[PDB]
Amino acid sequence: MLSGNPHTFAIWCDAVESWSTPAFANGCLGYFMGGKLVWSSNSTLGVDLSMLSRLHCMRNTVEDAELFHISPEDAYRELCNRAFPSMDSGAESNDFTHLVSAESLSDEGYYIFLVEYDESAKLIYGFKENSREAGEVVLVRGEFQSVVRDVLAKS
């Protein structure tokens, strides 16, 4: 199943019949972001989908003007800083506000963040601590949520 538009944002997912049981739809899940695909063949789609439905961005704004306007490289480093603060930071509560990776994707090491500005939005993504190779794609605001919501409706 494929919801959204791979040139901007889409989710592609399917169970593999031979990996699965009536309880566990096990198979593949990927995000297309500005034409690029990051994917995992390690997903249990019920668990991934129920967790996408409870991302902070589904019911709250994730406005951040700085992160929108700075480099993809710097933003991804700052977002990974917020999510995984070190002991230099003191005793700081971690921040997953902007994180929108499905669990299968996070668990492989794809960290994918949503930042909104006014009427636009950015997915900012990279692999692990490789901030140099980070990237992003400009979306319309609400586009990510609406694609997610579509995936949940169609299942």
Next chain:
Amino acid sequence: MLSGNPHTFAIWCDAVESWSTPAFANGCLGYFMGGKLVWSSNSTLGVDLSMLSRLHCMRNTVEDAELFHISPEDAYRELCNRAFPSMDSGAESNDFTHLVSAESLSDEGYYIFLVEYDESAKLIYGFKENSREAGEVVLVRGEFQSVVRDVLAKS
């Protein structure tokens, strides 16, 4: 001011008149733990005291049988794991349940945890990621809270 018993657990704190303003008591704070002292001369006592009053252990139990009975070295590593999970852990929410350092202390790098068992309790402490030189002192259960509560009463 000094509340508790340095041979088990005490808090020692005072404003420094020259660092302070009528609005802010700025000065020193230390924890004595089994006769050992860890201290900071960079504490704002209002902020430290109000944050001690809201530690998870003031309202909730922090029973943990494993952490009580294992090595100080291993327990401190496991507690620092929970508090500062890495990207290996996936996208996991940090855990400060057991942390009881005042902020001035955690900001310098003293991480001090409370673990309860039955009728007893342990402060488990170390500096930064130095799990080898960790240590602990056995307290009576409720002793830590009671000293904290005493510091708040006397201010």
